[PDB]
């Protein structure tokens, strides 16, 4: 999770539409769980992360 969220902060860096706040990305960790356990839990965090947020990207 810290990974993705640096990742997320280095992208919002080269533009003013694409910074990413905190709220949002631990909203979707927990849809996470709303919608081998840990593996599963890693699998979906990646999903969910890029369904919610590739949406604000070109």
């Known amino acids: ?3 993705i969220f640096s990742m997320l902060e280095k992208f919002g860096q080269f533009h003013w ?3 990413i706040s905190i709220g949002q990305f631990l909203s979707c960790f927990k849809r996470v769980f709303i ?3 840990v593996d599963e839990i890693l699998w979906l965090l990646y999903q969910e ?3 919610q ?6």
């Open 17 to 19: 539409f694409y910074g």
């Open 1 to 3: 999770s810290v990974k």
């Open 53 to 58: 947020f590739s949406t604000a990207l070109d």
């Open 49 to 51: 992360v890029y369904c």
């Open 35 to 37: 919608k081998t356990r």
